[PDB]
C-alpha cells in the first residue's frame, strides 16, 4: 500500500506513469498515447504497477483528504472535546442473537475513532465490541481485552481493575452514574476527570 | 534513430579501431599518427550528420566520410594538407567549404 | 477528430526526431565555436613560442 | 475539433519554436564564445606588438 | 593439551539451578495467589446464581 | 571433563523447569485478569440485583 501510494505521489498522474512505462516502440506502432496507456494497463503490455487509473484517482483523493442515555453521552462528549475528562461505559444488554452481553467501552477513544452524532440520533448503537477495551458475552464466556491508549488493560491484578491513561498514569476523580435506559438493560458511566 | 554529430571522441575511436596491431606497433602508431599528425581518417558507416571537430587534425591527408547523411560540407578549414577526400553517398546539395 | 489526433502524434514523432537531430547540432555547434576559440589560442601560443 | 486544432497550433509552436530557440541559445553562446576568443586574440596581438 | 574451562562454570550453572528452583518457588506463590482468586470467583458465582433463583 | 557433564545431566532437567514453569505464568496472569473483570461485571450486576 505504501509503495503504490508512493508511486501515486511520485507521478502527477498515472497518465504520466503509464506514459513512462510506454516505450517508443508502442508509440510508433499504435500511433496514439491514450490508447497506448489503456494498452499499458497492468503488465498486460507493460511494467505498470498494479494500480487501476480509477484506483489512482481514489488514492490521490485519499492523500488529499489526509432516552437520558443520549443526553448523558452528549454532555460526556462535550467534556471529552473540552479535554478535561476521560470516560468509560458499562453496558448490560442483549445482542441480535439474544445472548446477554456485558461491555466495558472506551467512550473517549471510540469518540476519537468515529463520530457519535449518529449514536445520539439513534441510527447507530454503542455496543460491546472485541475492539473495545473489555468485552464479555455471557454465553460465549470469553473476555476480550484491548490496550487502547485511552485505557490500558493491566498485566495482572488480584484485587480490582486498574485501567491506565497515558498522560496521568492513573492505573483520579472518578464519578459513577447509573442511568435507566430503554434499549439497553443497564447503563453505567465512569468519569475520570483530567 | 538519432543522427549524432561528428566529434573528436569518435575520431579517436576510429583511429583506435582501424588498426588492431601489436604493442610495439601500437607505440609506433602513437609516435606516427598523433592527433595533429593522423595520416588518414576513416569514419564510414556511422551515419555522420555534420562535419565538426577537425581543428586538431592539422596534418590530415586522407579523409573518408562515405555512406552517411552529411548535408553541408564544412569544418574542413584546418585540413590544409588534405589530399584525398571522400564525401560520397551523402545528402550534399551544394558544394562549399573547400 | 481522428485525423487531428493523427497529425498531433505524427508531428510529435517528427518533432522528437528533428529535436534530437539539430539539438545535437546546436550543442556541438557550441563545441565548434569552442574549437575555434581553442584553435585561435593555440595558434597564438605557437606564434609567441 | 476546436480544442484539437488549438492543440495542433500549440504543439506546432512547441516543435518549431523549441528548435528555433535551441538555435537561439546556439547563436547566443556562439557569439559570446567567439567574441571572447577574438578579444583574447586582440590582447595577445598587442602583446605581440610590444 | 590440558586447557579446559567449563568444569569451573558449573558453579555458575549450579547458581542457575538454584535460581531455577527459587523462580519455581515464587511462581508457585503467584500460582497460589491466582488460584485464591479462582476459588473466590467460583464462590462469588455460586452465591450470585443462587441469589438469582431466589 | 567428566563432572560438568555429570551436573549437565540434571541441568537439562532444570532447563525443562525453565520451560514449563515459565509457560504457566502468562496463562495464569491472563486468567486472573479476566477473572477480576468478571468480578467487577458481576458486582455491578449484584448491586442492581439488590435494588
Swiss-Prot record, chain B:
Cellular compartment(s): Cytoplasm, Cytoskeleton, Cilium axoneme; Cell projection, Cilium; Cytoplasm, Cytoskeleton, Flagellum axoneme; Cell projection, Cilium, Flagellum
Role according to the record: Component of the nexin-dynein regulatory complex (N-DRC) a key regulator of ciliary/flagellar motility which maintains the alignment and integrity of the distal axoneme and regulates microtubule sliding in motile axonemes.
Assembly information from the UniProt record: Component of the nexin-dynein regulatory complex (N-DRC). Interacts with DRC1. Interacts with TCTE1/DRC5. Interacts with DRC7.
Family: Belongs to the DRC3 family.
Start and stop residues of the LRR repeats: 37-58, 59-80, 81-98
Name of the molecule in the record: Dynein regulatory complex subunit 3
Residue range from the parent sequence: 8 to 105 of 523
UniProtKB/Swiss-Prot annotation, chain C:
Signal sequence region: none
Localization per record: Cytoplasm; Cell projection, Cilium, Flagellum; Cell projection, Cilium; Cytoplasm, Cytoskeleton
Spans traversing the lipid bilayer: none
Quaternary assembly: Component of the nexin-dynein regulatory complex (N-DRC). Interacts (via IQ domain) with CALM when calcium levels are low. Does not interact with CALM in the presence of Ca(2+). Interacts with the HSP70 proteins HSPA1L and HSPA8. May form a complex with CAMK4 and HSP70.
Domain-related comment: The IQ domain mediates interaction with calmodulin when cellular Ca(2+) levels are low.
Homology family: Belongs to the DRC9 family.
Function: Component of the nexin-dynein regulatory complex (N-DRC), a key regulator of ciliary/flagellar motility which maintains the alignment and integrity of the distal axoneme and regulates microtubule sliding in motile axonemes. Binds calmodulin when cellular Ca(2+) levels are low and thereby contributes to the regulation of calcium and calmodulin-dependent protein kinase IV (CAMK4) activity; contributes to the regulation of CAMK4 signaling cascades. Required for normal axoneme assembly in sperm flagella, normal sperm tail formation and for male fertility.
Name assigned to this protein: Dynein regulatory complex protein 9
Gene name linked to the record: IQCG
UniProtKB/Swiss-Prot annotation, chain D:
Family named by the database record: Belongs to the DRC10 family.
Function noted in UniProt: Component of the nexin-dynein regulatory complex (N-DRC), a key regulator of ciliary/flagellar motility which maintains the alignment and integrity of the distal axoneme and regulates microtubule sliding in motile axonemes.
Subcellular location: Cytoplasm, Cytoskeleton, Flagellum axoneme
Protein origin, superkingdom: Eukaryota
Organism name: Homo sapiens
Name of the featured protein: Dynein regulatory complex protein 10
Subunit: Component of the nexin-dynein regulatory complex (N-DRC). Interacts with CFAP52.
From Swiss-Prot, chain E:
Annotated compartments: Cytoplasm, Cytoskeleton, Microtubule organizing center, Centrosome, Centriolar satellite; Cell projection, Cilium
Function: Component of centriolar satellites contributing to primary cilium formation. In complex with CFAP263, acts as a regulator of ciliary beating that connects radial spoke 3 (RS3) to the inner dynein arm (IDA) and the nexin-dynein regulatory complex (N-DRC). The complex is positioned parallel to N-DRC and forms a connection between the arch at the base of RS3, the IDA tail and N-DRC.
Recorded family membership: Belongs to the CFAP263 family.
Known partners and oligomeric status: Forms a complex with CFAP184; the interaction is required for functional activity in cilia. Interacts with HAP1 and PCM1.
Protein name (Swiss-Prot/TrEMBL): Cilia- and flagella-associated protein 263
Organism: Homo sapiens
First-to-last residue of the parent protein present: 217 to 270 of 377
